[PDB]
Structures are given as C-alpha cells and as structure tokens.
Swiss-Prot record:
One of its GO terms (molecular function) is structural constituent of ribosome. This is Large ribosomal subunit protein uL29. HAMAP family: Ribosomal_uL29. Keywords: Ribonucleoprotein, Ribosomal protein. Signal peptide: none annotated. It comes from Thermus thermophilus (strain ATCC 27634 / DSM 579 / HB8). Part of the 50S ribosomal subunit. Belongs to the universal ribosomal protein uL29 family.
Length: 70
RNA sequence: AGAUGGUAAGGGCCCACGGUGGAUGCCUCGGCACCCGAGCCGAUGAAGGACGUGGCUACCUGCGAUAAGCCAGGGGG
C-alpha cells in the first residue's frame, strides 16, 4: 500500500504480542480468501488489494518471527 | 514448266521485368585467445532438481505457502 501506511503498519504490529499477531494474520488470511472469492466471480475491480493483503500478511509474520527471536 | 516466300504445335539464343532462393557486403545483444584478478561450497542440508508462486500468466527470470517477494543498513534521486 502507501509507504506511510506500511510504516504505521510496522509500528503497530511491533506493539502487538505474538498472540495478537497470530490473531491478526488469521483475520487477514480470512479476508484474503474473501478477496480470492470476489476476484473469482469478477467482483474485485481493485485487484491491487490482493497483493497488498499478501504483503501485509508477510510483514506480520515477519514481525511475529521477530518477536520469538530477539 | 520453273522458282521463291508467309506457317510455329512447340523448341532454341538474346534483351526486359518478375517469382523463388538466400549468396555477398555492411552489422553484432555472442564467441575465441592471452593476461590479470580472484578461488571452495555442504547436516546451520550443498551442488543440482521436482512442484508451486502474478487480479488476467504458455514459457523464461525471480521467489518459496511470508512465494516477481518480507525486515533492516548502505548506495542512488
Ligand atoms: Mg491468494
Ligand atoms: Mg488461479
Ligand atoms: Mg501472504
Ligand atoms: Mg515458306
Ligand atoms: Mg516460334
Ligand atoms: Mg504457342
Ligand atoms: Mg534448336
Ligand atoms: Mg526473403
Ligand atoms: Mg566482445
Ligand atoms: Mg571459485
Ligand atoms: Mg538449491
Ligand atoms: Mg517458475
Ligand atoms: Mg495465478
Ligand atoms: Mg535458464
Ligand atoms: Mg502448507
Ligand atoms: Mg498461495
Ligand atoms: Mg515492502
Ligand atoms: Mg527495503
Ligand atoms: Mg536505510
Ligand atoms: Mg533506503
């Protein structure tokens, strides 16, 4: 997404505990599956949202992997 | 009576223009040689692979369910 929103996403993710982080990823993964459904019926005009959520999930798992590895 | 020509189904030689074919010249993202530099990787799972991976994705490249990418530092504008 926008570069400032990535930065804010990383500040907030880093204030989350591993349990919060897992629960967020589980939520964003659900929304990603919702995006794939929508895109498969031709309903996702804004297809950039699929990639954005995928990288979001990557950042969150990266920070989750950070917090179990200081 | 005598004699000499017009005939071209087709063919031959030459001239013109085309078709085919891809020589020659020019060209080079490639290659060759020499020199110099530099020289190990791997159970912390190598080399090399299979299968995946993009909103649309046959192949190649990249990457690995965090999947043409994730975090940070440096360069750059
Ligand atoms: Mg998906
Ligand atoms: Mg598909
Ligand atoms: Mg993802
Ligand atoms: Mg005659
Ligand atoms: Mg004739
Ligand atoms: Mg004739
Ligand atoms: Mg003849
Ligand atoms: Mg030709
Ligand atoms: Mg050369
Ligand atoms: Mg070597
Ligand atoms: Mg390998
Ligand atoms: Mg591939
Ligand atoms: Mg696809
Ligand atoms: Mg290749
Ligand atoms: Mg799996
Ligand atoms: Mg996937
Ligand atoms: Mg990014
Ligand atoms: Mg970066
Ligand atoms: Mg930096
Ligand atoms: Mg930078």
């Amino acid at each position: 997404m926008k570069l400032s929103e990535v930065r804010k996403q990383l500040e907030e993710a880093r204030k989350l505990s591993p349990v919060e982080l897992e629960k967020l990823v589980r939520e964003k993964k659900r929304e990603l599956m919702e995006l794939r459904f929508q895109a498969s019926i031709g309903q996702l005009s804004q297809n950039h949202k699929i990639r954005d959520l995928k990288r979001q999930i990557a950042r969150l798992l990266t920070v989750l992997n950070e917090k179990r590895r200081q």
